Each structure stands twice: as C-alpha cells, then as structure tokens.
C-alpha cells in the first residue's frame, strides 16, 4: 500500500505532439456539414449499415 507510484503510467506514456489540422467550421456551417454528411449523400456506406467511426 505504498504511495510512491502516483503518476506512474501518465509519467511513462510516450508523449506524442498533436498534429496541425485545419480548423473546423462552427455554428450553422458545422450543422450544415453534418446534415450533408448524414442525410444528403450516402457515399461512405457499403450497404451494411455500419457506424460513422467504424474502423472495420
């Protein structure tokens, strides 16, 4: 029951710098983008009804 390891895993996790990505739209534009992704086009679907963040 020692207190010596208190920031063990966070301390030893290899730091990875965040990428430089483009700014996202905000407000009405972001909602329009969501509406276009979800209801207007069916591009990414394979007919199998997967999720938006499916990696398989």
């Amino acid at each position: 029951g020692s207190l010596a390891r208190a920031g063990k895993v966070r301390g030893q996790t290899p730091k990875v710098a965040k990428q430089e990505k483009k700014k996202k739209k905000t407000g009405r534009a972001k909602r329009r983008m969501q509406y276009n992704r979800r209801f207007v086009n069916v591009v990414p679907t394979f007919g199998k009804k997967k999720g938006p963040n499916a990696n398989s």
Partner: peptide, 30 residues
Amino acid sequence: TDPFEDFEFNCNTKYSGGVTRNLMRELNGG
C-alpha cells in the same frame, strides 16, 4: 467482420454490449 455470429459467440464475454449494438445496427440501420 460479421455482427451476426459475433453476437453468437461473444454475448457472454466482455464484448456483449458492442456486438449486440452492432447486430441491432445491421438489422434496423435507421
């Protein structure tokens, strides 16, 4: 990856909720 039998041999394991959710997503996708 197939939800149908994933649910048939994972519903007792740690992954019951995920495979159940995927199987229901296949069945009624909207």
